[PDB]
Every structure is written in C-alpha cells, then in structure tokens.
Curated annotation (Swiss-Prot):
Protein name: Small ribosomal subunit protein uS11c
Lineage: Eukaryota, Viridiplantae, Streptophyta, Embryophyta, Tracheophyta
Range within the parent protein: 22 to 138 of 138
Gene (name only): rps11
Main location: plastid
Naturally occurring in which organism (per UniProt): Spinacia oleracea (Spinach)
Entry similarity comment: Belongs to the universal ribosomal protein uS11 family.
Cell location: Plastid, Chloroplast
Function according to Swiss-Prot or TrEMBL: Component of the chloroplast ribosome (chloro-ribosome), a dedicated translation machinery responsible for the synthesis of chloroplast genome-encoded proteins, including proteins of the transcription and translation machinery and components of the photosynthetic apparatus.
GO terms under biological process: translation
Record key words, sorted: Chloroplast, Plastid, Ribonucleoprotein, Ribosomal protein, RNA-binding, rRNA-binding
Self-association state and partner proteins as the record states: Component of the chloroplast small ribosomal subunit (SSU). Mature 70S chloroplast ribosomes of higher plants consist of a small (30S) and a large (50S) subunit. The 30S small subunit contains 1 molecule of ribosomal RNA (16S rRNA) and 24 different proteins. The 50S large subunit contains 3 rRNA molecules (23S, 5S and 4.5S rRNA) and 33 different proteins. uS11c interacts with bS21c.
GO molecular function annotation: rRNA binding; structural constituent of ribosome
An example Gene Ontology CC term for this record: chloroplast
Length: 117
RNA sequence: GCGGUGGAAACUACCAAGCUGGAGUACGGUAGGGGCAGAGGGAAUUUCCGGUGGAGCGGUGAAAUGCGUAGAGAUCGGAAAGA
C-alpha cells in the first residue's frame, strides 16, 4: 500500500505473547503481526517459535512494500527477545540498529503482590 | 538487746581547706539518609485528546470471566494528575 524505503520494527516481548509491529520514522504504523494472529493460542503463544513465525510474517508484508533498511526495537522480558531477532536476520533485510527499549521505572507505582503458588 | 559513762579515730558519716583522672564550659576543627520547614527534578504508570492501523488483546498448571469492529492492544505526538 505504502512503499517506504526505511523505517522501524517494534518487537514487544511479554511472557504470554510477543507483538511485532512495522512502522516508519515519521512515527506511523504500517502493518503488524502478533504471535496470536498466526493461529497460536495461549501456551504455545509464549514460545520463541511463535515469535519466529510472527517476525517472519510481518517481514513478508514489509518486503512486499519493498523496504530495505530498518531499526529493531525490543521491549520486554519475554523469550522472543532473542528468537524474533534471528527472523529479522534471515528474512534478508538490512539491519541498521537493534535497541532495547524495555521500560525501567526509576521508582514508582508499587507492583502487584507476590503470587503464592 | 537496750540505757549510762571512760577511752580509740582506720572505714562510713559530719566540719574546714585543698587536688585533677570522673562530669561539664569555652575555643578550634571535621563526617553525617539526624529532625522540622521551604524550593526544584526525572524516568515509569494510568486516564483523557488526536494520527496510523485493523483482529485479536490480556491472562493460567490448562482455561474462562474481562477488554475489542461503537476500532482494543501496538505505535507516534500531545496534555493532566498523584504516589
Ligand atoms: Mg504462562
Ligand atoms: Mg553501750
Ligand atoms: Mg579521719
Ligand atoms: Mg569539700
Ligand atoms: Mg518537608
Ligand atoms: Mg516528563
Ligand atoms: Mg484505516
Ligand atoms: Mg465481552
Ligand atoms: Mg463510546
Ligand atoms: Mg479509521
Ligand atoms: Mg492504546
Ligand atoms: Mg506533575
């Protein structure tokens, strides 16, 4: 739909799922792919493999718009933080910068209590 | 045991003067999340207002309630607030 030569890839990795969004430097969203939209449900939705197919599935659409260089943003403690990165590499798209944006509060809102499990 | 009387003068007690090592005062330093009061600061989060986008998000041992086509989550820009 839009052919943008350079932009950014946001990958949020949580413990139950990982979102991979494709955007451009103007701060605008083009197309996204989630581990859940790939036909995965809750348990499997956390594994690095679903993050793999998620990243691959977004980059399908990003090469279809004909884009070349990109920055990678990784947010969150989950597993896909490593796995997704591999996909970004093997999908044959030039890797500019890979940053870790995981929000670190400098103090603040008191987190939920400890699960006694 | 109590009372009277004659002696002794070390220890406690009393009376008079002394002495610093105890306790303080002045002086000069120095470390400190000590206390009270008044200024300022940033992350993060939540909600609200927009632009993109367009099906799931969220969550568990595995699920479901819940939130979502009345456009969620994601992402960029703005405000506001408290801790
Ligand atoms: Mg889990
Ligand atoms: Mg006698
Ligand atoms: Mg005497
Ligand atoms: Mg005296
Ligand atoms: Mg105060
Ligand atoms: Mg600020
Ligand atoms: Mg649209
Ligand atoms: Mg419902
Ligand atoms: Mg409404
Ligand atoms: Mg619209
Ligand atoms: Mg949102
Ligand atoms: Mg404020």
């Amino acid at each position: 739909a839009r052919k943008i030569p350079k932009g950014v890839i946001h990958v949020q990795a949580s413990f139950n799922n990982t979102i991979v969004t494709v955007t451009d430097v103007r701060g605008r969203v083009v197309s996204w792919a989630s581990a859940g939209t790939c036909g995965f449900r809750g348990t499997k939705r956390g594994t690095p493999f679903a993050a793999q197919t998620a990243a691959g599935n977004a980059i399908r659409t990003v090469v279809e718009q004909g884009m070349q260089r990109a920055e990678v943003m990784i947010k969150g403690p989950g597993l896909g933080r490593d796995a997704a990165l591999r996909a970004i590499r093997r999908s044959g798209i030039l890797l500019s910068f890979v940053r870790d944006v995981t929000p670190m509060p400098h103090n603040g809102c008191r987190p939920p209590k400890k699960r006694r499990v």
